């Protein structure tokens, strides 16, 4: 159990780090996805002059 919990301790600590990395990618993708919404408006704005 002592040596066994050590394997789970590193596992929980390992998954904890990966959980933070995944959150960074979610926020990174969310921020990048939000940028597409702004750039997407530029496409219509570039042609908004033509009715």
């Amino acid at each position: 159990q002592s040596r066994g919990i050590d394997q789970v301790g590193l596992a929980v600590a390992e998954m904890d780090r990966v959980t933070q990395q995944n959150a960074a990618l979610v926020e990174e993708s969310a921020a990048a996805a939000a940028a597409l919404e702004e750039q997407a408006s530029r496409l219509t704005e570039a042609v908004a002059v033509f009715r």
């Binding site: 066994g4 919990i5 789970v8």
Partner: protein, 52 residues
């Protein structure tokens, strides 16, 4: 794997308690017998004193 060791650790705990508890009963019974022998020495010593 941890759950499997819990049963073993818990099983050995109860099994050891049965032997430990049983080992105490025979120990207490042995003490009472030793106490009876203590009074026997007093009787032999007292009886031997009367012979002297």
């Amino acid at each position: 794997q941890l759950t499997a060791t819990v049963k073993q650790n818990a099983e050995n705990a109860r099994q050891a308690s049965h032997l430990a508890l049983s080992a105490s009963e025979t120990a207490q019974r042995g003490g009472k017998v030793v106490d009876n022998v203590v009074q026997t020495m007093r009787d032999i010593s007292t009886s031997s004193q009367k012979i002297a």
